[PDB]
Amino acid sequence: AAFNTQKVLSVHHWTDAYFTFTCIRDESLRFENGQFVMVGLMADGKPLMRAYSVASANWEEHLEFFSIKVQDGPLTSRLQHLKVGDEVLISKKPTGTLVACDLNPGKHLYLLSTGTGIAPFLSITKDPEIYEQFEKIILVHGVRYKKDLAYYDRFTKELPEHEYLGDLVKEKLIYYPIVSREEFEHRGRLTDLMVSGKLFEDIGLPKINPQDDRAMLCGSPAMLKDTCKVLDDFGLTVSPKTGVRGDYLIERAFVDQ
Ligand SMILES: Cc1cc2nc3c(=O)[nH]c(=O)nc-3n(C[C@H](O)[C@H](O)[C@H](O)COP(=O)(O)OP(=O)(O)OC[C@H]3O[C@@H](n4cnc5c(N)ncnc54)[C@H](O)[C@@H]3O)c2cc1C
Ligand SMILES: NC(=O)c1ccc[n+]([C@@H]2O[C@H](COP(=O)([O-])OP(=O)(O)OC[C@H]3O[C@@H](n4cnc5c(N)ncnc54)[C@H](OP(=O)(O)O)[C@@H]3O)[C@@H](O)[C@H]2O)c1
Numbered sequence: 001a002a003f004n005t006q007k008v009l010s011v012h013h014w015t016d017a018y019f020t021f022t023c024i025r026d027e028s029l030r031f032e033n034g035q036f037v038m039v040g041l042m043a044d045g046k047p048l049m050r051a052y053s054v055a056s057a058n059w060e061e062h063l064e065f066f067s068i069k070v071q072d073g074p075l076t077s078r079l080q081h082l083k084v085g086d087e088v089l090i091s092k093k094p095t096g097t098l099v100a101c102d103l104n105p106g107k108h109l110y111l112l113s114t115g116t117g118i119a120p121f122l123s124i125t126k127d128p129e130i131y132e133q134f135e136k137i138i139l140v141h142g143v144r145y146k147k148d149l150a151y152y153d154r155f156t157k158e159l160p161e162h163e164y165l166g167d168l169v170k171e172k173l174i175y176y177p178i179v180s181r182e183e184f185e186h187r188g189r190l191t192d193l194m195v196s197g198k199l200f201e202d203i204g205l206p207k208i209n210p211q212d213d214r215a216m217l218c219g220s221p222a223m224l225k226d227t228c229k230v231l232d233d234f235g236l237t238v239s240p241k242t243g244v245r246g247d248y249l250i251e252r253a254f255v256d257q
């Protein structure tokens with residue numbers, strides 16, 4: 001009664017560390033884009049569950065998840081072996097802090113992510129309502145290597161032409177991939193590129209200010225710590241709590257061991 005069992009519909013491995021899967025969505029699972037649920041498997045006769053951002057949008061028929069693969073991680077050491085037709089467990093009470101309703105009004109929305117932390121923004125960039133709220137939405141995704149830029153084709157080619165969303169996306173979404181460990185046009189960590197001025201110059205926007213710029217952050221605990229400092233120094237005020245407005249919102253992409 002705490003979870004539903006759903007059939008897996010697709011599985012795609014981007015790298016040795018990242019994969020995407022989709023599954024049937026229960027008719028009762030309503031959610032706000034950006035929220036997370038619990039996802040898992042039956043293991044040793046009991047559910048084995050972990051928090052996962054819903055990567056699909058709430059208007060989409062199926063669920064999508066973007067997942068790490070940790071070879072000695074209790075869940076994903078098993079989850080990495082999903083096949084089409086397998087069963088996964090999905091919980092029933094979505095929650096989380098990455099909800100657009102909690103943002104103060106602004107002109108620009110920075111979606112700042114590393115690694116699998118792009119996951120809630122796969123959902124939010126498919127929310128038609130976010131595009132009316134901002135003049136520009138800047139999806140920043142930092143990863144180690146070019147191969148780790150999962151969804152590169154979605155954001156450079158597909159989404160601007162989307163039959164439902166393209167008229168909203170094409171003039172407003174700016175995709176800013178960052179690669180830290182090999183040659184690339186945006187090189188290093190998003191924190192350094194924001195402080196140095198390079199990110200703003202590349203995208204053609206003015207420096208972040210408290211009147212115009214809002215953000216959502218999803219990444220490692222260390223990335224959140226460093227990125228919060230950057231935004232605080234720019235003069236932004238974090239939301240103190242779910243349901244309370246702020247200039248920016250944060251959520252941990254995982255918990256350190
Ligand atoms: C709010 C929230 C949302 C989350 N959403 C997602 C999501 O959409 N996709 C996802 O892959 N994970 C997500 N995570 C992490 C997820 O809950 C699990 O940690 C993940 O499924 C790994 O589970 P595990 O049992 O295999 O390993 P764990 O025992 O949970 O972790 C093992 C090791 O891997 C590290 N680790 C775990 N997950 C990640 C990750 N995603 N990226 C980098 N290092 C990681 C841990 O810090 C630890 O060192 C989320 C976590 C939280 C708190
Ligand atoms: N070997 C690989 O090619 C590869 C690729 C992906 C995932 N993985 C594995 O998967 C797990 C998770 O790795 P991940 O790469 O997804 O996550 P990650 O270690 O958090 O790194 C993702 C990106 O975030 C950057 N970053 C790290 N700390 C930061 C901070 N404080 N502020 C801003 N940016 C920061 C990293 O830059 P830096 O390069 O400076 O660390 C990298 O570009 C690990 O076990 C890892 O070994 C490995």
Ligand SMILES: [Mg+2]
Pocket residue numbers: 029030031032058059
């Ligand atoms: Mg819904």
